[PDB]
Design a binder for this molecule. Structure first.
Ligand SMILES: OC[C@H]1O[C@H](O[C@H]2[C@H](O)[C@@H](O)[C@@H](O[C@H]3[C@H](O)[C@@H](O)[C@@H](OC[C@H]4O[C@H](O[C@H]5[C@H](O)[C@@H](O)[C@@H](O)O[C@@H]5CO)[C@H](O)[C@@H](O)[C@@H]4O)O[C@@H]3CO)O[C@@H]2CO)[C@H](O)[C@@H](O)[C@@H]1O
Length: 476
């Protein structure tokens, strides 16, 4: 009797490319490409397990632009320059970026602490600040190759910084090829999402928010977004086909977001399986075991992720010693294995790039220990999405209706339903009436609404500038 374990690592960035200048206004796609997007599939070269990945089309576009040398990334330009050529504004931006990342374990360099404690920085100090900001985002592969430069910790020269940059761009240029390779070798399945990561259930039917939050106020949806919902899915299928040569049959719904209407749309678009969150199952049925394959109206297969396990990795284990965290995770799988007489399917689904910056050494000791341990436990079989979809010796159940929601508490409150988020929707609704190009689709991405109307939010003004620039461009 096996336990079937399915990892599905979701990779996404909103479009940081300002449409009028072409400038990438934040470096997050670059930094997660060099830290996570190559290295997460690359674990499959060293560990004999299956791991699955979701890549959004808008992320793929940006990886392609960086790989082609075409991305004009304003923060990265300030890193590359000789410090003697740095603008006053660029020095301020380098300092602020460091301050915002300062407490993350991947920034634990003694030299960064000294530099931040200085009033004015000379050329040699700025070179270290530039290069250490680069090296903080070093991924597993290059932590081996650049080991000696990493152990320097200070006193970096322009030549050394340029060397690091060249190795980083080499990783980016190989990234889409590693996803093709692990897919063709059967080491994992690759899925995609509707193109700009929108909330499909809201685009199809804004009133579905009232299934979980009846007291919420929403704007007047005086225009239909239903055909845009279809476009996001269709364009995503075409982009995936561009990269991999086949149409996708698995999709990750952005924010785990499903509704009866959304599931019908994914079925109509030829999607054979998706996953969503355990809270949706709990809201939709009484007997909510997430260890079964579900069939929605015999049209599409649905798995519900194990929320506990997914959130342990995504939010809890950064605060743990790595061996203890692996012991805890394996112990939880053992208890699931002992708790049922059938073979349970255990979906672990979360973002593949967001939690690691908070782990010691970018979570590399944790993942290496976790993957090494899993590959030797003969009662665990990790599966591709294709294998999870086909497995005959699992329990199944038919489901006829779901209550619409997301993996955020089963509801949509992170993107709609307060004064400030509703103004964004009102802006989008009015722009849609006058839209003349697909930049309206860019503005439908979930990220813009995530950041709106939130205190904290690092670089909130940049996301607001991007959203409103896409809204403006869509009407020209
Ligand atoms: O400067 C701002 C900000 O920018 C950059 O962050 C990027 C991310 O790197 C990028 O991935 C993208 O983030 C979006 C995710 O792609 C999207 O999936 C969603 O992820 C949020 C988390 O969702 C789940 O967590 C849920 C819990 O499970 C549940 O308990 C409850 O807590 O709710 C959570 C959902 O809200 C996944 O489990 C978890 O792993 C995900 O992390 O939304 C993201 C935001 O739209 O885009 C952002 C920028 O928009 C930069 O990389 C980051 O450090 C920086 O602060």
């Amino acid at each position: 009797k096996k336990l079937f374990l399915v990892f599905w690592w979701h990779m996404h960035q909103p479009l940081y490319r300002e449409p009028y200048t072409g400038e990438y206004l934040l470096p997050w796609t670059f930094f997660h490409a060099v830290k996570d997007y190559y290295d997460m599939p690359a674990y499959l070269k060293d560990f004999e397990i299956k791991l699955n990945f979701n890549l959004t089309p808008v992320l793929i576009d940006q990886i392609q632009e960086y790989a082609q040398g075409k991305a004009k990334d304003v923060f990265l330009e300030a890193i590359r320059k000789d410090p003697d050529d740095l603008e006053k504004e660029e020095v301020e931006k380098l300092i602020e970026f460091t301050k915002l990342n300062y407490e993350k374990p991947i920034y634990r360099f003694e030299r960064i602490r000294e530099l931040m404690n200085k009033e004015k920085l000379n050329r040699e100090e700025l070179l270290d600040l530039q290069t250490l900001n680069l090296l903080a985002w070093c991924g597993r592969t290059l932590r081996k190759d650049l080991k000696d430069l990493l152990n320097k910790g200070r006193n970096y020269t322009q030549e050394e910084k340029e060397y690091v940059l060249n190795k980083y761009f080499e990783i980016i240029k190989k990234t889409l090829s590693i996803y093709r390779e692990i897919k063709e070798e059967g080491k994992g399945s690759v899925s995609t999402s509707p193109y700009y990561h929108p909330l499909i259930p809201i685009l199809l039917n804004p009133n579905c928010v009232y299934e979980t939050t009846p007291n919420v106020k929403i704007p007047d949806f005086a225009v239909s977004f239903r055909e845009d919902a279809s476009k996001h899915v269709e364009l995503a299928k075409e982009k995936y086909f561009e990269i991999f040569g086949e149409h996708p049959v698995y999709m990750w719904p952005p924010e785990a977001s499903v509704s009866n209407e959304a599931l019908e749309l994914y079925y109509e678009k030829g999607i054979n399986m998706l996953a969503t969150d355990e809270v949706i199952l709990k809201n939709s049925v009484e007997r909510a075991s997430p260890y079964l394959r579900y069939y929605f109206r015999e049209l599409i297969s649905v798995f519900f992720r194990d929320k506990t396990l997914s959130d342990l990795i995504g939010f809890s284990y950064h605060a743990w010693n790595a061996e203890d965290a692996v012991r805890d995770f394996i112990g939880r799988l053992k208890k699931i294995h002992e708790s049922v007489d059938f073979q349970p399917v255990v979906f672990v689904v979360l973002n593949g790039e967001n939690c690691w910056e908070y782990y010691e050494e970018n979570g590399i000791p944790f993942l290496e220990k976790l993957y090494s341990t899993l590959e030797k436990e003969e009662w665990i079989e990790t599966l591709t999405l294709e294998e999870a979809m086909r497995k005959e010796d699992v329990k199944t159940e038919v489901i006829e209706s779901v209550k619409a929601g997301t993996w955020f508490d089963g509801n949509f409150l992170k993107w709609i339903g307060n004064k400030e988020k509703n103004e964004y929707w009102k802006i989008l609704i009015e722009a849609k009436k006058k839209a003349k190009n697909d930049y309206i689709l860019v503005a439908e991405g979930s990220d813009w609404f995530w950041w709106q109307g939130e205190e904290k939010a690092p670089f909130v003004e940049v996301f607001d500038k991007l959203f409103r620039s896409f809204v403006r461009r869509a009407q020209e």
